[PDB]
Every structure is written in C-alpha cells, then in structure tokens.
Design a protein around this ligand. Structure first.
Ligand SMILES: CCCCCCCCCCCCCCCCCC(=O)OC[C@H](COP(=O)([O-])OCC(O)COP(=O)([O-])OC[C@@H](COC(=O)CCCCCCCCCCCCCCCCC)OC(=O)CCCCCCCCCCCCCCCCC)OC(=O)CCCCCCCCCCCCCCCCC
Ligand code: BCL
Ligand code: BCL
Ligand SMILES: CC[C@H]1c2cc3[nH]c4c(c3C)C(=O)[C@H](C(=O)OC)c4c3nc(cc4[nH]c(cc(n2)[C@@H]1C)c(C(C)=O)c4C)[C@@H](C)[C@@H]3CCC(=O)OC/C=C(\C)CCC[C@@H](C)CCC[C@H](C)CCCC(C)C
Ligand SMILES: CC[C@H]1c2cc3[nH]c4c(c3C)C(=O)[C@H](C(=O)OC)c4c3nc(cc4[nH]c(cc(n2)[C@@H]1C)c(C(C)=O)c4C)[C@@H](C)[C@@H]3CCC(=O)OC/C=C(\C)CCC[C@H](C)CCC[C@H](C)CCCC(C)C
Ligand SMILES: COC1=C(OC)C(=O)C(C/C=C(\C)CC/C=C(\C)CC/C=C(\C)CC/C=C(\C)CC/C=C(\C)CC/C=C(\C)CC/C=C(\C)CC/C=C(\C)CC/C=C(\C)CCC=C(C)C)=C(C)C1=O
Ligand SMILES: COC1=C(OC)C(=O)C(C/C=C(\C)CC/C=C(\C)CC/C=C(\C)CC/C=C(\C)CC/C=C(\C)CC/C=C(\C)CC/C=C(\C)CC/C=C(\C)CC/C=C(\C)CCC=C(C)C)=C(C)C1=O
Ligand SMILES: COC(C)(C)C(=O)C/C=C(\C)CC/C=C(\C)CC/C=C(\C)CCCC/C(C)=C/CC[C@H](C)CC/C=C(\C)CCC=C(C)C
Ligand SMILES: CCCCCCCCCCCC[N+](C)(C)[O-]
Ligand SMILES: CCCCCCCCCCCC[N+](C)(C)[O-]
Ligand SMILES: CCCCCCCCCCCC[N+](C)(C)[O-]
Ligand SMILES: CCCCCCCCCCCC[N+](C)(C)[O-]
Ligand SMILES: [Fe+3]
Lengths: 240, 281, 298
C-alpha cells in the first residue's frame, strides 16, 4: 500500500542523503595517509567529492576543496614504536616547535576582515568609540601565571568590532614588550588576571605579532596554539 | 589511517589512568585505559543480552526484551531469568557510559581543548540513570524501570504515561518539550544561516559574519551572534534533557495522581475559585 | 567558559547594505547588557517592508480573534479570564458543515477567520525570510528550512482536514485543548507509536538535541582558538577546525568539516517535521489504525 511505499521510499532517500552528507565532510584532511605521509591504502567506501570553489571577499582569491594538502611547516616528531598507532614524541620543545596540544596551522598571514574590508580585530585604543560597558575592566590589572608569579600587566583589550566582543588581552612584560592573551584562557578577577595554562616564565615565549595594530590568522593560530599547549607542557610549573 | 593534518597531534600524554600503557590508537580510534574499560563493559553486556534472548527463545530483535524484576522483589536482587540479568546489564550499561565519558576527557586533554562535550554528555547519562536507578529506588523497586527492548520500551513509556492520565499535563514535561522544540528550531536556523553565508547566490562572494548578524536583525530585530548561538544550542539541549529528568523523578514519587488534576491548584485560588461562569464555574 | 566576563561596546551597528532598501530598516534599539552576556547586546534595527507589515498585522488579528473569543467565554470577567485561561478554546466547525465556509460564528466560523489570518500571516513571513536573504545575496537555506516546519502546520490544519472532508478534523486554538486533541488523535489512529514516521520523527528530534549538544560544546571547547568564527575557518582551516574534527575522529571513528557539520545540522532538524508531516498525513487518509497496519504492513 501507499504507506508501505512511502516508508520504503524514505529509507532510500535517507541512505543517499547520508552518503551525500558524508562525502561533503571529506573536503578537508583527505585523502588519508600513513604516518610517513604516503597515501594510505584503504580510504573507506566513500569517494572524494567533486571539488567546489569558494570566492573569498575583498579580492582575496578563491579556495578549492578538496585540493592538494600540505602542512607547510616542519613537524618535530619522532616515532616511539615500530608499528602504526602509537604516539610520536616531540624531538625538541613541543611548545617552541608547535606540536601536540601546542600545534598551529599555517593559516594565511593576513588578518580577518569585516564585511567592509577593514581589520575585524583591533586594539581598543584604535577602535573609535569602544569601551568596557560591563564587568571589570582588565586594563591596568597585573597578570598572574599558574606558578602564582606576576608576569605583566594588561595595557589594552583587542576587540572584535563587528561582533563587539573582547578577543584578546594585550599584556606588557617586564622588558617592555607585549603579547596577546586569548580572552578565553584567562580569568579576570577583581584585583588581577589569572592565567592557568602558562607559568610566568613562559609568557616571553608567546609568539609576537609583526605589526602593533593588527593580528593575522597565522599569528592567532601560533598564539592560541602556544597558550593552549601550556595546559599539558607547563604542568610541572603549575602548583595549586 | 591518518587525516592529512593528524600526525602533529598524536603526541603522548593526557591520560587520566595508567600512564603510557594504553596511550595509543587503533585505526582512527583512540583507546586509552577507558578505551579498554568500555570495551569490556560493552562485551559483557551484549553477551548477557544474548543470554536473555535464549531464555526468551527468540533471536528476532523486534521481539527480544530484557525485563527488570517484578515489583515483588522490591530493591533486592532477583534470579537471572527473573530479573537479575537486567540488573547486571544495567550495571554494565552504566559502566559503558561513564567510561565513554572519561575517555572523552582523556582525548580532550591530549588535544588541549575544553571539557564541554564530556560535560554535556553527562546529562544524557543522568537522564538514563534517572529512569533505571534514581526513580526505581525512590519508588522502591527495580520494577519501575523500563525494559531493554525496541518496542517493549515504547510500551513502558505509553503505560507509565497513561498511568497518570494524559501525561501532557505534567508541568515539567511541558517545559522539557518547549526546549526540545526550541532547540530543534535553533539548530534549523543556525545550520541554515552559516550555509547560506558560505554558499551564497551563484557567482557571488562568500558572505561574512556581518551579513549573518544583519540578515537576522532585518528578520526579527536581533542577532545573538556566532558565540551566542553556540552557547544557546548547548544550553537548550542540556535544558531539554534536564527538565525531562525532573518531570520523571517527580512522577510517582511526590505526585502519584492524575497530572491534569494538579492544575486545580491554580483554578481554586480563593480570589476567583467561586466566581461563576467560564469553563470551571 | 559559558558567559562573557567583560563587555565591550561601540557605535550601534547598522549592518551591511547589499541590495537592501535602507529606507525600510528601522532605527537601532537600546542595548541589553543583560543580553550582552549570553550574546549580542544590540537591539535592532529591523526591516519593516510590505510583507513584514501584512504578516505582523495578520499575526495580531489571528491572536486577537482568538483573544475576544476567550473573553466571550470568560463572561467578560477579568478574574475568570485568568482562572480559566488554559481551558478556553476556539474549536473548528462541527463535522456537519464539512469543508463548508458557512458555519455560524459561535459554531466554527470564528475559527475559520482566525485560521485565515494565520495562513496569511505565516506565508507572508515565509516570503519575508526569502526576500531578506535575496537582498543580501545569500543562499536561501533559511526559507527552505522554514518550509519544512510549514509542511507539518500545513498538514495539521489544512491539507488533512481537506483530504478527510471536514474542518472538524483540524486543531482547536487553545492551550489544554490542543494538547487533548493530540493525545486523542493517537488514540483514534491506533497509537501513533506504531506510525513509523512518528518514530522516525522522534529519532530526529532526539537527534537534534544530541547534535546541537555536540556542535555547541565542541565550538565552545575550541573557541580558545577562535572556533566560533566558522566562515573564515571554512575559508582557511585553523587548528580549531582540526582539533574539533580530531576529537571526534578519535572518539567515534569519523568526523565532520566546519561547513560539513552544518549540513548535518540543517538536515537533522529539517527531517523532524518533514517525516512528521508525512506520518500525520497518512494518518486517517490511507491508514486508520497504525497497530493493524503494523501487523500486516499494508
Ligand atoms: C512530500 C514532501 C513535501 C513537503 C515539503 C517540505 C520540503 C522541505 C524541504 C527543505 C529542504 C531543506 C534543504 C536545505 C538546503 O540545502 O537548502 C538550500 C538549497 C540551495 O539554496 P540556494 O539558495 O538555491 O543555493 C545556494 C547555493 O548555490 C547552493 O548551496 P548548497 O550547496 O548548500 O545547496 C546544494 C544542496 C542542494 O539541495 C537540494 O537540492 C535540496 C533537495 C530537496 C529535497 C527535498 C526532500 C523531499 C523528501 C522526499 C521523501 C520521500 C517521501 C515520499 O545539496 C544538497 O543538500 C543535496 C541533498 C541530497 C539529497 C539526496 C537525494 C538522494 C536521492 C536518492 C538516490 C539513490 C540512493 C542510492 C541508494 O535549496 C534548494 O535547493 C531548494 C529545495 C526546495 C525543494 C522543495 C520541495 C518542493 C515541494
Ligand atoms: C528518553 C525517552 C524514552 C524513550 C522513548 C522513545 C520513543 C518515544 C521513541 C524512541 C525511539 C528509539 N529509542 Mg528510546 N526512549 C528511552 C530510552 C532509550 C535508550 C536508553 C538506553 O536510555 C536508548 C538507547 C533508546 C534508543 C532508541 C532507538 C531504538 C530509537 C531511536 C532513538 C534515536 O534516534 O535517538 C537519537 C540518537 C541517535 C540518532 C544516535 C544513534 C542512535 C542509534 C539509533 C542507537 C540505537 C541503539 C539500539 C539499536 C540498541 C543498541 C544496544 C546494544 C549495544 C545492541 N531509547 C526513554 C525510555 N524512544 C523511537 C523509535 O522509533 O524506536 C522504537 C521512538 O519513537
Ligand atoms: C498522546 C500523544 C501521542 C502523540 C501524538 C502526536 C501527534 C498528534 C503529533 C505528534 C507529533 C510529534 N511527536 Mg508524538 N505523540 C506521543 C508521544 C511522543 C513522545 C514520547 C512519548 O516520548 C515524543 C518524544 C513525541 C514527539 C513528537 C515530535 C517528534 C512530533 C512533532 C515534532 C515537532 O517538533 O513539531 C513542532 C513543530 C510544529 C507544529 C511546526 C509549526 C510551525 C509553525 C509555522 C509555527 C507558527 C507559529 C504561530 C504562527 C504563532 C507564532 C508564535 C508567536 C509569535 C510566539 N511524541 C503519543 C503517542 N505526536 C506530530 C507529528 O509530526 O507526528 C508524526 C503530531 O502531529
Ligand atoms: C524545522 C523544524 C523546526 C522549525 C524551523 C523553523 N521555524 C522557523 C524557521 C525555521 C527554520 C524560520 O525561519 C522562522 C523564523 O523566522 O524564526 C526566527 C520560523 C519560526 N517558527 C516560529 C515558531 C515555532 N516554530 C516551531 C517549530 C519548529 N520550527 C520546528 C521544531 C514551533 C513549535 C510549535 O514547536 C513554534 C511555536 C516563529 C518564531 C517563526 C515564524 C514566525 C511567523 O510566521 O510569524 C507569523 C505571524 C506573526 C508576526 C505573529 C506575531 C503575533 C504575536 C505578537 C503574538 C503573541 C504576543 C505574546 C504574548 C508576546 C510575548 C513573548 C515573551 C517571551 C516576551
Ligand atoms: C544531553 C542532550 C542529548 C545528548 C547529548 C550527547 N549524547 C552523546 C554526547 C552528547 C554531548 C556524546 O559526546 C556521545 C557521543 O559520542 O556522540 C557521538 C553521546 C552519545 N549518545 C548516544 C545515543 C543517544 N543519545 C541520546 C540522547 C541525547 N544525547 C540527548 C537528547 C539518545 C536518545 C535515546 O535520545 C541516544 C540513543 C551514543 C550515540 C553516544 C554515546 C555512545 C556510547 O556510550 O558508547 C558506550 C556504549 C556502547 C558502545 C554500547 C554499550 C552496550 C550496553 C552495555 C548494553 C546495551 C544496553 C542498553 C541499555 C539497551 C537499550 C535498548 C533500547 C532499545 C532501549
Ligand atoms: C544570529 O541571531 C540569532 C540566532 O541565530 C541564527 C538564532 O538562532 C535566534 C533564534 C532563537 C530563539 C528564538 C531562542 C529564544 C529562546 C527562548 C524563548 C527560551 C526557550 C525556552 C522556553 C520557552 C521554556 C521556558 C521555561 C521556563 C522559564 C521554566 C523556568 C524554571 C522553573 C519554573 C522551575 C521548575 C520547577 C518545577 C516545575 C517544580 C514542579 C513541582 C511540583 C510538580 C510539585 C535568535 C533570536 C538570534 O538572534
Ligand atoms: C565543527 O566541528 C565538529 C566536527 O568536526 C569538525 C565533528 O566532527 C562533529 C561530530 C559530528 C558529526 C561527524 C556528524 C554526524 C554525527 C551524528 C549524526 C551523531 C550520531 C552518531 C553516531 C550514530 C555514531 C555513533 C558511534 C559511536 C559511539 C562509535 C562507533 C563505534 C564503534 C563501532 C566502536 C566503539 C568503540 C569501542 C568499543 C572502544 C574503542 C575501541 C577499541 C577496540 C578498544 C561535531 C559535532 C562538530 O561540532
Ligand atoms: C489580553 O486579551 C486580548 C484580547 C487583548 C488578547 O489579545 C489575548 C489573546 C489570547 C488569550 C490569545 C491566545 C491564543 C492561543 C492560546 C493560541 C494557541 C494556538 C495553538 C496552540 C495552535 C496550535 C495548532 C494550530 C494549527 C496546526 C493551525 C493550523 C492553521 C492552518 C494550517 C491554517 C489553515 C487555513 C484555514 C482553514 C482557512 C483557509 C482559507 C482560505 C481561503 C485559503
Ligand atoms: C551503577 C550501579 C547500577 C546498578 C543497577 C541495579 C543493581 C542492583 C544492586 C542490588 C544488589 C543487591 N542488594 C539488594 C543486596 O543490594
Ligand atoms: C541524520 C542521519 C541520522 C538518522 C538516524 C537514523 C536512525 C534512526 C532509527 C529509528 C528507528 C525507526 N523506525 C522506523 C523503526 O521506527
Ligand atoms: C557508526 C560508526 C562508524 C565508525 C566508522 C569507523 C571507520 C573505521 C575505518 C576502518 C579501520 C579499521 N580497523 C579497526 C580494522 O583497523
Ligand atoms: C546515524 C548516524 C550514523 C553515522 C553514519 C556513519 C558514517 C561512517 C563514515 C565512516 C567514514 C570512514 N573513514 C573514511 C573515516 O574512514
Ligand atoms: Fe556552528
């Protein structure tokens, strides 16, 4: 009957749909590889989808996926076993090298632009008409690392103009240079800003930005990467 | 075996239990100590379930059903064929679930991300525990739990419901449903919003988040934004399930009568209780 | 974390100006600091336009046409009105009138008026979702997603009442009354738990919660690497997208991309009322009792 028809029909629809859904999520990081980077033998039942090309605003070109994949940065890792499936140990300083939970991707070295073609993110000093409207203004508060030692002082807030949001705290270190600190990895308190991931001694290692009034996708990744990695690698310095 | 960008992430560490012992992968999958735990609990449980199936004398999945002990057994142990098997199976499920959560924690650490996912999952686990542990205890027999079978479980739902009248009147049930509906609404929108920006009209440039915020203010005069909608989603979801637990944990424990009748409180407020006319006067 | 720990404000954002008729957009509203915690603090502006007004006017007419009926039931007494608010009900015409538009007002006519108002209200608002997108050059996802919802509503109070031969088969406007109608609709058709569309529909509802839980917690888990900035992540994969995909690959064996995850999303939610609509449509037109149907499959 009709009902039987409809339901049998639907289970068929649903199956080609999953198939669709699945092949679309195969647009990045495919095809699969062996730990040595050579193409892996068994890529699953699903074919790579036919490529699609994105037209990036503000004449920043195009992006076609799937496409040629490459890390475009050295990886300082060495195998710890003779068969597949085991960890790869950092061969240096994982933090300094950017592997592990400290990994960063070679994103473009251009900043994210808003709908108008202006830099999406800005130090608040250069963002005409922005102010802390609620909560504790961090600016001026010392910054404490997981080792409970003071590392610097907030000397500005880098805001996201189109979404009117605090993205990073800029921090002034003992030598007078500054670093950005992701907003999402710090606790703003009444008399201090506490950073659990990094011990005071690692703040200097936080990668620097080439221009003082801009951050690029590459530098966001290298920073967030680094600060995140502290959680696992600063661990010996963290007390509480 | 690895995604084109996976290797630099596959470093040692992050394990909660047992150091480097189980710190490794099997194909795409991460094992970890709890990798093993869940496997063991999952193996055992499925076994017991098959064992129930022979005692039942059917291999047909639409028929197979593992029932809790009958009320006469209260919160004591029961013979295998008479409810023990369900009790173990329930222990094993719990073991599986919790372990699966703790593995999520272990992966979280290795990758250096937040614990929001293990977190949210614990709500699912807590809803399940409400229906097979917290409620039966409080009620006083494993027998109030739902049976493990594809349709028999739908039956428990239907019977348990109709016991208190039309269950629609359970007030926390009303609230819990509003989230389920609301969440789906919001998942519908979020998905649609991002896709429409990433896949504009033919030959046009990828839109921007600014267009996303604009599209919605134009539509309903407000936009929660990108960080917002993700906060929103997590919340509606967790809330739906939170109220779902609540509506059950109260049902049969502190309220055992017809749910519709509980509304008489409102209608019988002394200031309008006796005023004639309307529906109730 | 979940709530903002510092709020920053700037000049009210009047938004992108594509092909949008700026003459129709309103003025910026206030800013809720309250709101500012969960998400955006800025209210407005909003786009009015012809369809917005028609929609918005029919919308109120519907609501009010029901409202006066409730008052008439309450004996115009504000006390009763409050006491009995969820008990009042605007019911469709009796089965006697069939698909007739001649039912007396106290006997079903008022229901038709209200519905007519809702019909126009909803469709115009649909066209509104479409146009608002067109004017910014965006995909029409939202309008199509919306159409799914519309499907179930169309079926409940219009398509099914018409295929059954009478408006009496439609849903009454009322809080407790539309609950009862639902509960009763299942009883009559032999328990909707045997309607496999109903069962499918529940799977996608449950799933929507499962997914929006998964997606939300994930994006929050990696917002420490600017995860929420999904459009740029699509355009240039960040570590965020990577950690996201991998956490999931390592847990359950496969994974999404940032554009990908949102396709899972729109389809999981859209299938709820899509399947739903179908389950209800066959209910009572082709299948009288899902249990009997369940025994044979035919
Ligand atoms: C009876 C039911 C009737 C009830 C009415 C309710 C209908 C509600 C449907 C809502 C659909 C939501 C979809 C969301 C979406 O993608 O929208 C954007 C999508 C693109 O938007 P755009 O702005 O035009 O383009 C922007 C970009 O250029 C392009 O942007 P893009 O890349 O994002 O869009 C590409 C998109 C294009 O999307 C579509 O083309 C949409 C397809 C609509 C399908 C409708 C489902 C009907 C359910 C049938 C169930 C059977 C039961 C009987 O790709 C897909 O999503 C492909 C879907 C894959 C389907 C798999 C089919 C398998 C067939 C079986 C094969 C055998 C299997 C082997 C075994 O919109 C549409 O294409 C419109 C579809 C409208 C049709 C409505 C039906 C009319 C009646
Ligand atoms: C929480 C609310 C009620 C209840 C009310 C209903 C109602 C009402 C319905 C279901 C439906 C289903 N229920 Mg139930 N269900 C409950 C508790 C459970 C439990 C549990 C351990 O707590 C589980 C595992 C299930 C599982 C299921 C599926 C068989 C089915 C589709 C659900 C779905 O899409 O979810 C979304 C999740 C996903 C898409 C992720 C993938 C889920 C897959 C499908 C899981 C299948 C597991 C199953 C085959 C058993 C495996 C166990 C062993 C390892 C073999 N229910 C409680 C008692 N359930 C629907 C149905 O059609 O089944 C008859 C239906 O109509
Ligand atoms: C006793 C009750 C019966 C039963 C009878 C029914 C009936 C009858 C129906 C459902 C339906 C549904 N049931 Mg059932 N159901 C039962 C038990 C259950 C259980 C359970 C036991 O755990 C669950 C989980 C469900 C779950 C569900 C949903 C999956 C499904 C509706 C999805 C939806 O989101 O629509 C919500 C979305 C809409 C209604 C879309 C409307 C969109 C419109 C356009 C909104 C306009 C707004 C308006 C103009 C006002 C404006 C707003 C103001 C400005 C604020 N049922 C039992 C067996 N169920 C529906 C279905 O699809 O079944 C197959 C349905 O018709
Ligand atoms: C795919 C399935 C899900 C879905 C999707 C969906 N719904 C949608 C969309 C989509 C994709 C839209 O684009 C569209 C939308 O614009 O949302 C922002 C819509 C929408 N879904 C809505 C509601 C809705 N969707 C629902 C369900 C669902 N929608 C599904 C679960 C439900 C239910 C019953 O679960 C409801 C109630 C609307 C918010 C919106 C469609 C708006 C519309 O058509 O308006 C027409 C008429 C008016 C303008 C009426 C206004 C009259 C009011 C002023 C009266 C009430 C006054 C009241 C006392 C006010 C106070 C409220 C307080 C909280 C402050
Ligand atoms: C809290 C909000 C919602 C939510 C969230 C949620 N679910 C989650 C997560 C999150 C955040 C995960 O991270 C985790 C996941 O990895 O998803 C891919 C998970 C998950 N949610 C799942 C299912 C699921 N979630 C559901 C619900 C929900 N999940 C909510 C609505 C439902 C239902 C019925 O609504 C189901 C069916 C899994 C796909 C996955 C967890 C997988 C897992 O725990 O693996 C460990 C266990 C096994 C491999 C099998 C164990 C076998 C048992 C020992 C025996 C079988 C016993 C069982 C009781 C029989 C039941 C029979 C039925 C017919 C009744
Ligand atoms: C870019 O822009 C944006 C998006 O992106 C695309 C969006 O998606 C959206 C769209 C999102 C929305 C419209 C979501 C808005 C959310 C809501 C209106 C909330 C949803 C939830 C509800 C309606 C449920 C309300 C329930 C409440 C308040 C209950 C509170 C708690 C209690 C009463 C206590 C419980 C205790 C009980 C019952 C005790 C019982 C005792 C005995 C029985 C005894 C918007 C607006 C947006 O702007
Ligand atoms: C933006 O970012 C995001 C991503 O990517 C960038 C993502 O991918 C995802 C994840 C989401 C998707 C890929 C979309 C599709 C997902 C769903 C519809 C959810 C439903 C899921 C399932 C049905 C799969 C359930 C599968 C499970 C639990 C695992 C299957 C497992 C097995 C067969 C074996 C289980 C493992 C065992 C026994 C232990 C380990 C193994 C040993 C041998 C030991 C999200 C949410 C996301 O937000
Ligand atoms: C404060 O008092 C005043 C008077 C000021 C008020 O305004 C108060 C007002 C309230 C008390 C209002 C309360 C309103 C509610 C309780 C409403 C509840 C509504 C629901 C629960 C609705 C549920 C389901 C509705 C459904 C499925 C409607 C479907 C409608 C349609 C598909 C429309 C079909 C079209 C029809 C039959 C006519 C078509 C005619 C043509 C010519 C095309
Ligand atoms: C996480 C534990 C879940 C267990 C589910 C039910 C187990 C019942 C345990 C009772 C065993 C014996 N008793 C009555 C003497 O306590
Ligand atoms: C978006 C893809 C995920 C879809 C989930 C498919 C599994 C649902 C199984 C429901 C069982 C249903 N049925 C028809 C017997 O009632
Ligand atoms: C519904 C769950 C689907 C998970 C898919 C997992 C893909 C695994 C690919 C094969 C890897 C094989 N193995 C375990 C033999 O090494
Ligand atoms: C109801 C949800 C079911 C999810 C559908 C299962 C998809 C499995 C995809 C496995 C992909 C294998 N691969 C390529 C990663 O090895
Ligand atoms: Fe998202």
């Amino acid at each position: 009957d009709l009902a039987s028809l409809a339901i049998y029909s639907f289970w068929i629809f649903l199956a080609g749909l999953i198939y669709y859904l699945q092949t679309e999520n195969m647009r990045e990081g495919y095809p699969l590889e062996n730990e040595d980077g050579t193409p892996a033998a068994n890529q699953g039942p699903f074919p790579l989808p036919k490529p699609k090309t994105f037209i990036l605003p503000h004449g920043r070109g195009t992006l076609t996926v799937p496409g040629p994949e490459s890390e475009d940065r050295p990886i300082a890792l060495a195998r710890t076993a003779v068969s597949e499936g085991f960890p790869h140990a950092p061969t240096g300083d994982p933090m300094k090298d950017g592997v592990g939970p400290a990994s960063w991707v070679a994103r473009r070295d251009l900043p994210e632009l808003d709908g108008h073609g202006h830099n999406k993110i800005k130090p608040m000093k250069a963002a005409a008409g922005f102010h802390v409207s609620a909560g504790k203004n961090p600016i001026g508060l010392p910054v404490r690392g997981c080792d409970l030692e003071i590392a610097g002082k907030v000397v500005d807030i880098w805001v996201d103009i189109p979404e009117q949001m605090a993205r990073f705290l800029e921090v002034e270190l003992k030598d007078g240079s500054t670093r950005l600190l992701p907003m999402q990895m710090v606790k703003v308190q009444s008399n201090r800003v506490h950073v659990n991931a990094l011990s005071s001694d690692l703040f200097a290692g936080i990668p620097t930005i080439k221009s003082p009034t801009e951050v690029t996708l590459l530098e966001e990744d290298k920073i967030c990467g680094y600060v995140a990695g502290g959680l696992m690698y600063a661990a010996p310095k963290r007390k509480s | 075996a690895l995604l084109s960008f996976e290797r630099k992430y596959r470093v040692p560490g992050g394990t909660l239990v047992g150091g480097n012992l189980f710190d490794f992968w099997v194909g795409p999958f991460y094992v970890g100590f709890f990798g093993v735990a869940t496997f063991f609990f999952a193996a055992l449980g499925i076994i017991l379930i098959a064992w129930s199936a022979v005692l039942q004398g059917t291999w047909n999945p639409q028929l197979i059903s593992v029932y809790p002990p009958a009320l006469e057994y209260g919160l004591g142990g029961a013979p295998l064929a008479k409810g023990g098997l369900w009790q173990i199976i329930t222990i094993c499920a719990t073991g599986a679930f919790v372990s699966w959560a703790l593995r999520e924690v272990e992966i979280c650490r290795k990758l250096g991300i937040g614990y929001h996912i293990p977190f949210a999952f614990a709500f699912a686990i807590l809803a399940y525990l409400t229906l097979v542990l917290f409620r039966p205890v409080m009620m006083g027999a494993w027998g109030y739990a739902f049976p493990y079978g594809i349709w028999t479980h739908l039956d428990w739902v239907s019977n348990t419901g109709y016991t208190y009248g039309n269950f629609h009147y359970n007030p926390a049930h009303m609230i819990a449903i509003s989230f389920f509906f609301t969440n789906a609404l919001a998942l519908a929108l979020h998905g649609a919003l991002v896709l429409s920006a990433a896949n504009p009209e033919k030959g046009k440039e990828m839109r921007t988040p600014d267009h996303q915020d604009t599209f919605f203010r134009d539509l309903v005069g407000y936009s929660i934004g990108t960080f917002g909608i993700h906060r929103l989603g997590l919340l509606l979801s967790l809330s739906a399930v939170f109220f779902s637990a609540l509506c059950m944990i109260i049902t049969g424990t502190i309220w055992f009568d017809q749910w519709v009748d509980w509304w008489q409180w409102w209608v019988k407020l002394p200031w309008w209780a006796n005023i004639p006319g309307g529906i109730n006067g | 974390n979940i709530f903002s720990q510092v709020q920053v404000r700037g000049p009210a954002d009047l938004g992108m100006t594509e092909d949008v008729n700026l003459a129709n957009r309103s003025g910026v509203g206030p800013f809720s600091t309250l709101l500012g915690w969960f998400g955006n603090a800025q209210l407005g502006p909003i786009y009015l336009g012809s369809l917005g007004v028609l929609s918005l006017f029919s919308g109120l007419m519907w609501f009010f046409t029901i409202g006066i009926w409730f008052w008439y039931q309450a004996g115009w007494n504000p006390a009763v009105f409050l006491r009995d608010l969820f008990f009042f009900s605007l019911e469709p015409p009796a089965p006697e009138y069939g698909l007739s538009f001649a039912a007396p007002l106290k006997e079903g006519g008022l229901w038709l008026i209200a519905s007519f108002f809702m019909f126009v209200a909803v469709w115009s608002w649909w066209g509104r979702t479409y146009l608002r997108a067109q004017a910014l050059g965006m995909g029409k996802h939202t309008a199509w997603a919306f159409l799914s919802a519309i499907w179930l509503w169309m079926v409940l109070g219009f398509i099914r009442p018409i295929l059954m031969g009478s408006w009496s088969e439609a849903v009454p406007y009322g809080i407790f009354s539309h609950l009862d109608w639902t509960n009763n609709f299942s009883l009559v058709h032999g328990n909707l738990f045997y309607n496999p569309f109903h069962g499918l529909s529940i799977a996608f509802l449950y799933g929507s919660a499962l997914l929006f839980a998964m997606h939300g917690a994930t994006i929050l888990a990696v917002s420490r690497f600017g995860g929420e900035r999904e459009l740029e992540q699509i355009a240039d994969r960040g570590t965020a997208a990577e950690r996201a995909a991998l956490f999931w690959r390592w847990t359950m064996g496969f994974n999404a991309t940032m554009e990908g995850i949102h396709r899972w999303a729109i389809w999981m939610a859209v299938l709820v009322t899509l399947t739903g609509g179908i389950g209800i449509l066959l209910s009572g037109t082709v299948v009288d009792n899902w249990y009997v149907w369940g025994q044979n499959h035919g």
